[PDB]
């Protein structure tokens with residue numbers, strides 16, 4: 001199935017005009033464990049934001065605009081990128097807003113990392129109904145030597 | 160010679176334990192390029208945050224409490240930290256807090272990065288008299304989709 005994974009700050013803020021204000025190695029860690037060995041779908045701005053193709057995953061970039069990298073699979077439509085992942089147990093949608101927005105109704109599971117970071121949001125996560133999903137996992141953590149903010153890892157499943 | 164390198168926030172606010180609330184890759188590039196192939200002195204709090212020894216740099220941790228590792232040099236004092244590096248041209252004192260004020264008096268160069276991160280903290284980078292330190296290099300930068308904040312690189316010769 002399709003699952004979306006995201007790091008939402010307060011008010012579902014998932015993105016700024018610039019980089020996000022924090023150093024969260026742990027969530028990059030949590031992010032990888034969950035996407036590793038799966039096809040990842042992202043938009044050209046998430047693509048261009050990461051910089052390099054994620055190792056050990058198949059990258060599918062969605063954009064009605066033409067491809068600029070020989071190493072990644074590019075796509076022009078939603079249903080098109082779906083086929084690009086092929087035959088797989090799960091697909092991970094990494095973002096952002098439009099990608100989440102379009103895929104969400106096809107999403108059967110969630111991977112929310114909640115961060116106590118009040119920031120002014122350029123982009124936000126589609127309002128996910130609090131009773132259309134069940135929490136099957138949650139783990140809370142405080143900021144430590146390497147992470148700037150408190151966070152709570154959480155996976156949800158559609159009801 | 161003893162040079163100190165640090166990244167500051169408004170009003171000279173520096174890390175204290177948990178990681179700092181920003182994401183600045185250029186400063187780590189700047190940091191590395193200036194500290195590499197050189198002996199770097201640090202306190203215990205910084206060392207946890209780095210979480211491992213710096214590559215191509217002789218890492219010296221200054222502490223009174225038992226050096227819990229056998230890869231890095233652990234010293235108990237300042238005159239003792241100094242020797243650990245031998246006779247090299249430059250010794251970088253990377254911090255933090257306390258480690259900074261114990262070493263500024265012997266210093267002759269400052270490697271600052273002034274950040275537009277309005278952070279609250281208790282530790283301050285030692286107050287430097289600008290009629291005792293001449294500014295030489297100074298280059299401003301804008302925040303981008305990779306660097307979360309605006310920042311300025313600066314170099315102060317001691318005068």
Ligand SMILES: CN(Cc1cnc2nc(N)nc(N)c2n1)c1ccc(C(=O)N[C@H](CCC(=O)O)C(=O)O)cc1
Pocket residue numbers: 005006007027028029030031032046049050054055093094095111112113
């Ligand atoms: C734009 N970007 C955003 C990114 C980060 N965390 C998320 N976290 C969640 N929970 N969801 C997302 N969609 C998400 N996206 C990035 C940036 C770097 C890497 C990357 O190199 N990270 C690790 C490696 C960690 C490292 O050494 O930098 C990886 O291999 O997945 C991935 C995504």
Ligand SMILES: CN(Cc1cnc2nc(N)nc(N)c2n1)c1ccc(C(=O)N[C@H](CCC(=O)O)C(=O)O)cc1
Pocket residue numbers: 164165166186187188190191192194205208209213214252253254270271272
């Ligand atoms: C917490 N910490 C202390 C730290 C961080 N930024 C600073 N920035 C400046 N200007 N000055 C300092 N004294 C300083 N100290 C760190 C954290 C990570 C690395 C690090 O991972 N290594 C860098 C960069 C490595 C990389 O980007 O791959 C390096 O010097 O090799 C260094 C210092």
Ligand SMILES: [Ca+2]
Pocket residue numbers: 135136137
């Ligand atoms: Ca339950």
Ligand SMILES: [Cl-]
Pocket residue numbers: 042043044045046047095096
């Ligand atoms: Cl995008």
Ligand SMILES: [Cl-]
Pocket residue numbers: 201202203204205254255
């Ligand atoms: Cl310390």
